[PDB]
Amino acid sequence: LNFGQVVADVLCEFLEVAVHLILYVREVYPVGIFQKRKKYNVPVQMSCHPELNQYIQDTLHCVKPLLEKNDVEKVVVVILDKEHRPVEKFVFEITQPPLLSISSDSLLSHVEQLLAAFILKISVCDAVLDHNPPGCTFTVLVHTREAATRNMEKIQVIKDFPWILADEQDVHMHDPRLIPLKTMTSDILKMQLYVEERAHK
Amino acid sequence: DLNFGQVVADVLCEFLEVAVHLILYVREVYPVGIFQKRKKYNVPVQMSCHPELNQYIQDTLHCVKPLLEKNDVEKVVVVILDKEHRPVEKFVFEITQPPLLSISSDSLLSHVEQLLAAFILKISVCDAVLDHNPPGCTFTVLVHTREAATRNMEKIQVIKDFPWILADEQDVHMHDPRLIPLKTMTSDILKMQLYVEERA
Amino acid sequence: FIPWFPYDGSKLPLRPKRSPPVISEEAAEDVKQYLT
Amino acid sequence: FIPWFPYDGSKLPLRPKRSPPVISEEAAEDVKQYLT
Structure with missing residues (x-):
């Protein structure tokens, strides 16, 4: 039983819902596209825009083999302004511990409840973040344990959906304030989510 | 104003994934133990929790999606093969995409999902109208295109390391099957009918 | 009953080159105990 | 608060080459009216 693939399936499905909800809560796109x-038993807002949905799906589909092999350190949702400068980053840090004492007592059920706590927190995160002007677009960054250039073949799972090394401009924020949202530990996955926010005066 | 080909492709791919899982469950192609x-579509269904099976079905449908979007697909068929790899039963989803013009503004997608729900309900109870398959069956998926596949062979190879090939005649032909219709639907963006091919 | 697209041997369909996984009874029981 | 993986300029990440779509308020109105 390949638990690396189980963890990858669970995380890709979760990250897809989280990306949709981030876009809604931080007003990246007009509210009218969301339903x-x-x-995770939780009311989430999801885009009904087909091209946006396909972009998000394709992005996470490509991440899945890297997750399965435990080659991902963090997945980051970068919200960008009209000049493609980062406004805000939602950072999902990930580690997959030694898969050895894995519980037989409804493991995936316990994991889904821990992941539900992430979705619920995102849904109210406007209450703990600053209220800066919203961005108008976004990207997803995949930080790997090994050099990114050497995961290029592994990540390009989808025809005509190429990946590239990010520019420092896509990544770097100046002395950001780090706002923790949620942390979780489990037998198969440890994860923490925090936000990089613009610095104050 | 909107990419309704992509809408129909999305709706069909989500529906076919549920329908494939349910077919595998109700025809006992895999042990009940893997399903949850x-x-x-408001129906109580059964989905496999086996990761490699789930990825196989996902990869299969991700490959069909661009062909659905461009309305290049006549049929998607779930073929059940006996222990000698001969077709014993086929679930045939025939598809057409009508003129995408003056569609209804009255919750189009909710209406469509309601129509699709009826297909899931018919699959859910089809064991009582079909003969039981013999032990040792497996399955495959066939995609019939509107035109012969040179364009289609390029466009279907969406997923890394998941190649497609032209099927052989014995993957397809059943001699004089019994045809059992399950459900037909029509809508502003999709017409579809589902029937089963069975040994007579 | 007549289909919209009756069998036509002059145009073959596409199928995946790889077959779906074979799942033994032992592997099915592990999915049942761990993943459901 | 200390992250597990602090910023490291010497290890750039990968990102999709394609950009997500541009969605005007009017396109969103069509999504709302027809697809919700």
Whole structure:
């Protein structure tokens, strides 16, 4: 039983819901595209725009083999302004511990409840973040344990959906304030989510 | 104003994933032990929790999606093969995409999902109208295109390390099958009908 | 009953080159105990 | 608060080459009216 693939499936499905919800809560796109759905027993807002949905799906589909092999340190949702400068970053840090004492007592059920706590926190995170002007677009960054240039073949899973090394401008924020949102530990996955916010005066 | 080809492709791919999982469950292609109850289209269904099987079905449908989007697909068929790899039963989803013009503004997608729900309900109870398959069956998926596939062979190879090939005649032909219709639907963006090919 | 697209041997369909996984009874029981 | 993986300029990450779509308020109105 390949638990690396189980962890990758669970994380890709979760990250897809989280990306949709971040875009809604931080007003990256007009509210009119979103529809309330149920994920992790929790009411989430998901885009109904087909091209946006396909971009997000394709992005996470490509990340899945890197997750399966435990080659991902963090997945980051970068919100960008009209000049493609980072406004805000949602950083999902990930480690997959030794998969050895894995519980037989409804493991995935316990994991889904820990992941639900992330979705719920994102849904109210406007209450703990600053209220700067919203961005108008975004990207997803995949930080790997090994040099990124050597995961290029592994990540390019989808025809005509190429990946590239990010520019420092896509990544760097000046002395950002780090706002922790949620942390979780489990037998198969440890993860923490925090936000990089613009620095204050 | 909107990419309704992509809308129809999305709706069909989500539906076919649920329908494939359910077919595998109700025809006992895989042991019941791998399935878990879920709710799709307000119906209590069964989805595999086996990761490699789930990825195989996902990869299969991700490859069909661009062809659905460009309306290049006549049929998607779930073929059940006996222990000698001969077709014993086929679930045939026939598809057409009508003129995408003056569509209804009255919750189009909710209406469509309602129509699709009826297909899931018919699959859910089809064991009582079909003969039981013999032990040792497996499955495959066939995609029939509107034109012969040179364009299509390029466009279907969406997923790294998941190649497609032209099927052989014995993957397809059943001699004089019994045809059992399950459900037909029509809508502003999709017409579809589902029937089963069975040994007579 | 007549289909919209009756069998036509002059145009073959596409299928995946790889077959779906074979799942033994032993592997099915592990999915049942751990993943459901 | 200390992250597990602090910023490291010597290890750039990968990102999709393609950009997500541009979605005007009017396009969003069509999404709302027809696809929700």
